[PDB]
Amino acid sequence: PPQTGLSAEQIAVLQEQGFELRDEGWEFGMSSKVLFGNNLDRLNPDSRNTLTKIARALLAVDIDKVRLEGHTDNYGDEGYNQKLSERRAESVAAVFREAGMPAANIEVRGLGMSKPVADNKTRAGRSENRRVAIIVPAE
Amino acid sequence: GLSAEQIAVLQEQGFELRDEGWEFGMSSKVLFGNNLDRLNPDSRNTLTKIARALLAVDIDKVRLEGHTDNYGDEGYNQKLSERRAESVAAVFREAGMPAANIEVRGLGMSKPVADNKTRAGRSENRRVAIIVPA
């Protein structure tokens, strides 16, 4: 399949919103520390507003299908981190639905600690791993 | 203490007078469902109504107390219970309750109302309580 499903107008929005093109599509990893702070799956209220802006920016150029993927670092129990990561992605999904993203077009996954982008030996690396990613397919 | 009009509202809302104040306990299953500390939307709406009923008669100070059963890790259950009480606090602040007048506590498994030896009792113990000091 050619990766020509997105127009330049759509790519431009993805770039401005912080997305980078990766193997599974355009991806923006959002810091869980920023999104949730000390909470479990409840979003900071300011972060809810931030997320709504991103959803609306995407919807304004007809990017109306996303995958939301939750991730953790390697601290704690693996099953718990998987559950936490799924619930965190689901919280983001709720905000995207409220902004108008069609519910049938949102796929939610929790990957727990299984797909790190950084080394878990460092606080910085662990924080980079604690994220919720938005993925927009390029197909 | 509380005025007659305030007591009448608390009684109407289903609060019961206990040693530490008027108390209204709510099921964590109903409040959070499968979530961790994110309230489900219907429960948010129900909590907002309670907050507004209280604020309409100048009940503007509460304690929110989160509880668990004794199943699972003690430390996690305590954090969970504190975070769940904080979620309810956030709803009350959004309704207009002064932030400085809200006390949030997570008791974990330490203060059961029912028998943890039974499933029924463990379920009753998984709750968040709204308390209005008398």
From Swiss-Prot, chain A:
Activity regulation, per record = Both lipid anchor in the outer membrane and peptidoglycan binding are required for full activity. Once activated by certain cell stress, the dimeric YfiB transforms from a compact conformation to a stretched conformation, allowing the periplasmic domain of the membrane-anchored YfiB to penetrate the cell wall and sequester the YfiR dimer. GMP enhances the binding affinity between YfiB and YfiR.
- Protein topology in the membrane: Lipid-anchor
Q: What GO CC terms are in its UniProt record?
A: bacterial-type flagellum stator complex; cell outer membrane
- GO BP terms: bacterial-type flagellum-dependent cell motility
Null allele outcome, as annotated, is: Deletion of the gene does not affect attachment or colony morphology.
| Impact upon substituting F19S | Exists as a mixture of monomer and dimer in solution. Crystallizes as a dimer
The principal location of this protein is membrane
The UniProt function text for this chain reads: Activates the diguanylate cyclase TpbB/YfiN by sequestering YfiR at the outer membrane, which counteracts the YfiR-mediated repression of TpbB/YfiN at the inner membrane and leads to increased c-di-GMP production. May act as a sensor of envelope stress. Part of the YfiB-TpbB-YfiR (or yfiBNR) system, encoding a tripartite signaling module that modulates intracellular c-di-GMP levels. The system is a key regulator of the small colony variant (SCV) phenotype, and plays an important role in biofilm formation and in vivo persistence. The c-di-GMP produced by TpbB/YfiN stimulates the production of the Pel and Psl exopolysaccharides, which promotes surface attachment, generates an SCV phenotype and confers resistance against phagocytosis.
Q: Tell me the domain comment.
A: Dimerizes via its N-terminal region.
The protein's name in its UniProt record: Outer-membrane lipoprotein YfiB
Q: Which residues of the full protein are shown?
A: 30 to 168 of 168
Swiss-Prot record, chain B:
Name the UniProt key words of this record, in alphabetical order: Cell outer membrane, Lipoprotein, Membrane, Palmitate, Signal
- Occurrences of domain OmpA-like (ranges): 20-134
SS bond partners: none
Its domain of life reads Bacteria
Bilayer topology: Lipid-anchor
Instruction: Report the GO terms under cellular component.
Output: bacterial-type flagellum stator complex; cell outer membrane
Look up what happens after changing R63A: Weakens but does not abolish the interaction with YfiR
- Free-text activity regulation comment from the record: Both lipid anchor in the outer membrane and peptidoglycan binding are required for full activity. Once activated by certain cell stress, the dimeric YfiB transforms from a compact conformation to a stretched conformation, allowing the periplasmic domain of the membrane-anchored YfiB to penetrate the cell wall and sequester the YfiR dimer. GMP enhances the binding affinity between YfiB and YfiR.
- How is loss of this gene reflected in the phenotype of the organism? Deletion of the gene does not affect attachment or colony morphology.
In which family does this protein belong, per the annotation?
Belongs to the outer membrane OOP (TC 1.B.6) superfamily.
Q: What is this protein called?
A: Outer-membrane lipoprotein YfiB
Which source organism? Pseudomonas aeruginosa (strain ATCC 15692 / DSM 22644 / CIP 104116 / JCM 14847 / LMG 12228 / 1C / PRS 101 / PAO1)
